Symmetry: C2
Subunit: 583 residues, 2 copies
């Protein structure tokens, strides 16, 4: 259902705070959800659990963990319907109401919930256990594989993506209420015809006893259009368009109305009116060419891992404005909903991406014993959930289906083909892409024609023609010539950068130095400006972030333009110089 | 010839200073050495040239470079014989006297010289040009291979060892004089009978008209013994032995005496009376069991590359005493002669190693198109030169023939077999070893039985069972159990460590972190003390040093226990605690 909010007809209780916490063990205490959890450990809830406790065993845990607390259902919610929702459980979440299992959810970055109305009475207290598993298989969405170390028998988790596999309840948890007759979902699609905006709306409600009313109210509070019935099309004369650096949001009020025109339910949905179209080599927002600038990001901060953080979000956006970035990509999984809402308000453009990284074992990637049909089912599901949650965001401008898949290999085409079709059928208003890895050159890639925009990740400077920028430059523009020659589509570089340690400086060409980072980005830009077909540049990455451990990762990925704590490297100042002065 | 010194009969002029410097190029000036060099560039000589100039083209240069200066032979040197000597030219040096080639030397780390007596008159000035080439082939001592980048034509140098291929005149240059009848070489060998010390000596001198006297003088200037003739045996009653941690050096004056008892030539040779023996599993110095503590090192400092530096030498030795290290290994090439002399006086023990690192392409490494018989000729030459130079140092206790050869492969035994014998045949006073890489396990290695002591380099914690210390413990232990049950020899660990950035800290098990470094060294020690056959532990590395450019090297190699500028990481304090509280 829709993201809960408080209305005149709905109440909303945060369940954030400290919960009791335990790992699964191998004792008789199988089934921790059947009684009061016995632990001194408390884990804060919007957070990944891994780095919270300064304990290796928790950090390295493979398998299930348990969060628990008591909840009291407000006494005045008899006569109403009520749910427990996890905005996200990374990767597999189970909800229990006193020992009854009431939801079982497999994706790691989208919402799930359970209607507990008939299990617990208003004003009753219950024990809420939420079990979350972190295990990845070749069928989970980021896929991976658990192994056992021979000598010690320690379980270990392998996977093919960079960022660390933080787990837990990294986003907030809620108790909320709706009326018996309630709104469940709303879809809004926005076109523009001259100066007139139009909203195609569709409301889905638990009942059609009593009817649906809509009002559309502008930023000044004046009702600018009205409509009746669950589905319809509204015109808005002289619209204020939502624009890439000037957000404008109307506010769509969907209500359920009884025989007496008495409101029995209501929901307020923020709406930006704007259009995305791809025309040849151009990416058009409101019929005008747009050029992405900004980053691929990560949900990653010092202690709470991937947990949502209001402050770092608002700061992160301020830093985007400060350097004149107009966009980012939700690199390698959907971010928290609040980020998308905030982007809507900040006038920031978003490439919104599924959790589908790691579909590459370079052993044939797309085969029965690796990334097969059952993985595609999970991928299809990821696509549906992402789209079902983020479809109404004006800031969301395109769907990214995957990141660095092995789109050069046999089987890749048979695997991906249905997916861009599924997306476009779920949401026909946005174009679809994926992020292409170096191995799938314009010659070798077998999947690119099935997409509306091409996104490329490239590290010519760093990984291959190492510190040889003149060699990287030639190879970069060879590759881009190939792509422009072969496809009539917009090109966005979604990765390009260099690991860089704050304070490490050199007047020579030296990788891992701030000078090198600047020089490489600056070369890439020179090359970008040589190609009419370029529609965007998003540096990798906004900020240093944590990775699986490895002799080649210096306490994480240090390709950030800011440090993990958001201090700017020289690179940051270079981008600021370029993005505040370019078109 | 012997390392030149000033005596009553010999003069010695330093030619260190700034020299004019030029890269070779494709100009109508093939042949720089034939006229005054045209450059504004001056390179200081005891220095590698690569980082001096803050210029990428000089640094990345592949091939020849030219140093030049004017030199004046003293007017008072008529009636004498005189030479120009390079202590070292990395890797291939040529000496030119006004356009005449007079020396052509091929290894990068040993002396060469030319007698110019008849080409330049006393009191004459001449133009001294020394050409030095950096190119590594599969036949050079560190071997390597030059390649050409496809798009640009940049000439580039590949090789298989870590440390950066610094080139140039990294050690001092000299003009010196010797009488017509002179001492060319001395060999001293030292045994003990009870409390009497016995010096076996042999003097090689240019002629025999008039004879050889020898005097042995103690640290007090008291002549303690004498002898006549170009070779013989000197008896020293109640000898002051040379000991690890308590140097004592006698001073052996070889003279040439004419028909009158008038001195014609004299040379003063520092000697320490000491024996080295391997009996089963023990390493014995003066019939007392010995345990190595310290480091593999590198000649490497911030701007002068491999340039010898007195301050860093004295300081580095001071840091060794501070942490109670008693030894180091001349990791990957012979060090400056002056370091060996200083080790003699400091009572520091030395594993002295040839430049033969990188004999490993893991394609078969020991074949005609890789390490082949001509390569083995170069290797044999390197062994001869090293032994010829460092034969008289009591500090030097064992020759290391190579570092990380692929001694697990077919052909490796046929390649190395002659090499231990050659060393033992040139110098029968010391054991011979080599440093064994992880591929070459106790099972797989096929070379180890030809050596007197086994040295192992092992990185279980860092490179293989990464951050998994218990897993590394088990595999380290297994391995060592394999070597001890298979050979009756001393086992010295010569590499073990982890990249560690100063300042990077963590309460968790975190590679590259100061805490991790300590946790790993500490564990390795725990395993060492379980095995009676261990004869030494030498950490890799003493200090952070520069390497070739690469995404897995953070502006060089950071496995130092000290920083490049010699600041202690947490690990330095751990070793200090360990080595000062045990023998
Ligand atoms: C690592 C990935 C998957 C890709 O994404 C990465 O982004 C960031 C990073 O690189 O640091 C991090 O977020 C994280 O590490 C990853 O998600 C970056 C590109 C990537 C490293 C590819 C390459 O860079 C280049 C490769 C070349 C291609 C080719 C044709 C060549 O250049 O000659 C063959 C050789 C080689 C090394 C094959 C591997 C890839 C495709 C590589 C390393 C794969 C992984 C990519
Ligand atoms: C790099 C060397 C030659 C060795 O010496 C180096 O020490 C330091 C360093 O590693 O950075 C520096 O001083 C410098 O770079 C070198 O002198 C260190 C060990 C070394 C890296 C080996 C390993 O660490 C482990 C390897 C494993 C072992 C293997 C084959 C097995 O026996 O089962 C499994 C796979 C692998 C990766 C094969 C390579 C080696 C033997 C490796 C990397 C070889 C190079 C070694």
């Amino acid at each position: 259902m829709l993201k809960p909010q408080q209305t005149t007809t709905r109440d909303l209780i945060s369940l954030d705070g400290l919960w009791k916490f335990a790992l699964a063990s191998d004792d008789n205490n199988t089934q921790p959800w059947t009684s009061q959890l016995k632990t001194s450990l408390e884990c804060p809830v919007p957070a990944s659990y891994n780095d919270i406790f300064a304990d290796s065993k928790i950090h390295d845990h493979v398998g299930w963990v348990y969060y628990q607390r008591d909840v009291i259902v407000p006494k005045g919610w008899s006569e109403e319907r009520y749910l427990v929702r996890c905005e996200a459980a990374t990767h597999h979440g189970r909800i229990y109401v006193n020992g009854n299992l009431v939801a079982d959810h497999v994706g790691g970055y989208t919402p799930f919930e359970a209607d507990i109305t008939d299990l617990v009475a208003a004003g009753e207290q219950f024990r809420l256990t939420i079990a979350v598993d972190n295990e990845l298989t070749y069928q989970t969405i980021p896929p991976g594989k658990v192994e056992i170390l021979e000598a010690t028998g320690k379980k270990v988790q392998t996977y093919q993506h960079d960022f660390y596999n933080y787990a837990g309840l990294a986003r907030s948890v809620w108790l909320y209420s709706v009326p018996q007759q309630h709104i469940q979902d709303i879809t809004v699609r926005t076109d523009v015809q001259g100066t007139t905006g139009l909203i195609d709306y569709n409301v889905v409600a638990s009942t059609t006893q009593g009817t649906i009313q809509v009002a559309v109210i502008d930023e000044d509070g004046t009702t600018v259009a009205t409509s009746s019935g669950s589905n319809g099309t509204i015109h808005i004369p002289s619209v204020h368009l939502w624009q890439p650096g000037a957000a404008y949001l109307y506010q769509l009020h969907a209500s359920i109305i009884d025989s007496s025109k008495k409101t029995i339910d209501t929901y307020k949905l923020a709406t930006g009116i704007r259009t995305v179209k791809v025309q040849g080599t151009q990416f058009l927002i409101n019929d005008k060419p747009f050029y992405f600038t900004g980053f691929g990001k990560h949900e990653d901060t010092n202690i709470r891992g991937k947990g949502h953080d209001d402050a770092y979000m608002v700061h992160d956006f301020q830093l985007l404005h400060w350097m004149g970035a107009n966009s980012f990509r939700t690199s390698h999984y959907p971010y928290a909903e609040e980020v998308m809402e905030y982007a809507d308000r900040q006038g920031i453009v978003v490439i919104d991406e599924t959790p589908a990284v790691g579909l590459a074992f370079s052993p044939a990637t797309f085969s029965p014993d690796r990334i097969n049909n059952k993985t595609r089912e999970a991928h299809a599901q990821a696509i549906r959930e992402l789209i079902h949650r983020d479809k109404n965001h004006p800031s969301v401008v395109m769907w990214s289906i995957a990141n660095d898949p092995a789109s050069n290999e046999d089987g890749a085409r048979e695997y991906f083909a249905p997916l861009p079709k599924l997306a476009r059928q779920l949401d026909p208003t946005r174009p679809v892409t994926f992020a292409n890895v170096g191995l799938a050159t314009y010659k070798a890639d077998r999947i690119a024609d099935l997409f509306d925009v091409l996104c490329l990740n490239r590290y010519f400077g760093w990984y291959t023609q190492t510190a040889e920028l003149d060699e990287a430059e030639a190879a970069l523009e060879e590759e881009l010539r190939g792509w422009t020659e072969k496809y009539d589509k917009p090109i966005v570089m979604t990765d390009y950068g260099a690991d860089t340690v704050a304070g490490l400086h050199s007047v020579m060409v030296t990788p891992w130095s701030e000078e090198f980072q600047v020089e490489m980005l600056d070369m890439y830009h020179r090359v970008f400006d040589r190609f009419e077909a370029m529609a965007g540049e998003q540096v990798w990455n906004f900020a240093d972030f944590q990775t699986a451990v490895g002799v080649s990762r210096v306490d994480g990925n240090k390709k950030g333009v800011f440090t993990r704590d958001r201090k700017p490297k020289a690179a940051a100042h270079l981008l600021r110089k370029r993005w505040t002065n370019l078109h």
